[PDB]
Amino acid sequence: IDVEKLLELLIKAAAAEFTTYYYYTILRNHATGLEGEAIKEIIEDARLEDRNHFEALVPRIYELGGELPRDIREFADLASCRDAYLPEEPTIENILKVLLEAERCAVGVYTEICNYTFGKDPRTYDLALAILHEEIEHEAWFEELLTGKPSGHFRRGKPGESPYVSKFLK
């Protein structure tokens, strides 16, 4: 494995998770009214688990000899996803669209990392797989709410449970 490339991938994914922890706060606060109370706890579940994803990526970055960038704006500019901005018309459907685009991008990032470390770096692969479980379940929550396609998921009992990444957490 070319380890500088994996370090770029991992830093970009961790910037995606950190920015996501911010933008989801904003999105959570605008899920308002009767429809929004339905999706608020789900946004909060995804936001806390994603910040846990950041908390799991950083130790692996420093394991491989990389560092987080000096400036937090450099970090934000490195995000592998685009910013989950609040829509101009922040309806519940428009917000769900933004959240679904974010978790679809996140699934792709971690699929890319797993397809990079498969049979080559088992620790990073296992970590990217653990985050990929939770990003797939994030995408399913928001795609069932926005489109109605049944994907059989439930709401975590408490936000930030992160059942698949917890063994990388303290």
Among the listed residues 9, 10, 61, 99, the single contact to a copy of itself using CB under 8 A: 61
The residue whose two tokens read 């929550």 is 141
- Contact partner at residue 17 from a copy of itself, Fe ion, none, CB < 5 to 8 Å by partner kind: Fe ion
Among the listed residues 3, 4, 33, 82, the single contact to a copy of itself using CB under 8 A: 33
Q: Can residue 12 be called a binding residue for Fe ion (CB under 5 A)?
A: no
Cβ at position 118, least distance to a copy of itself in Å: 6
Q: Can residue 156 be called a binding residue for Fe ion (CB under 5 A)?
A: no
Q: Which two tokens stand for residue 86?
A: 């609040």
Consult the annotation and say whether 138 binds a ligand. yes
Alpha-carbon distance 92 to 32, whole Å? 8
Q: Can residue 143 be called a binding residue for Fe ion (CB under 5 A)?
A: no
Q: Which two tokens stand for residue 32?
A: 């308002």
Cβ at position 135, least distance to Fe ion in Å: 5
Q: Which stretch binds a copy of itself (CB under 8 A): 3-11, 34-42, 97-105?
A: 34-42
Compute the half-sphere exposure of residue 143: CA atoms within 13 Å on the CB side of its CA: 15
The region, left, alpha or beta by phi > 0 then psi within -120 to 50, assigned to residue 169 is beta
Q: Which two tokens stand for residue 129?
A: 């797989």
Alpha-carbon distance 167 to 5, whole Å? 25
Chain positions contacting Fe ion, by CB under 5 A:
17, 50, 53, 106
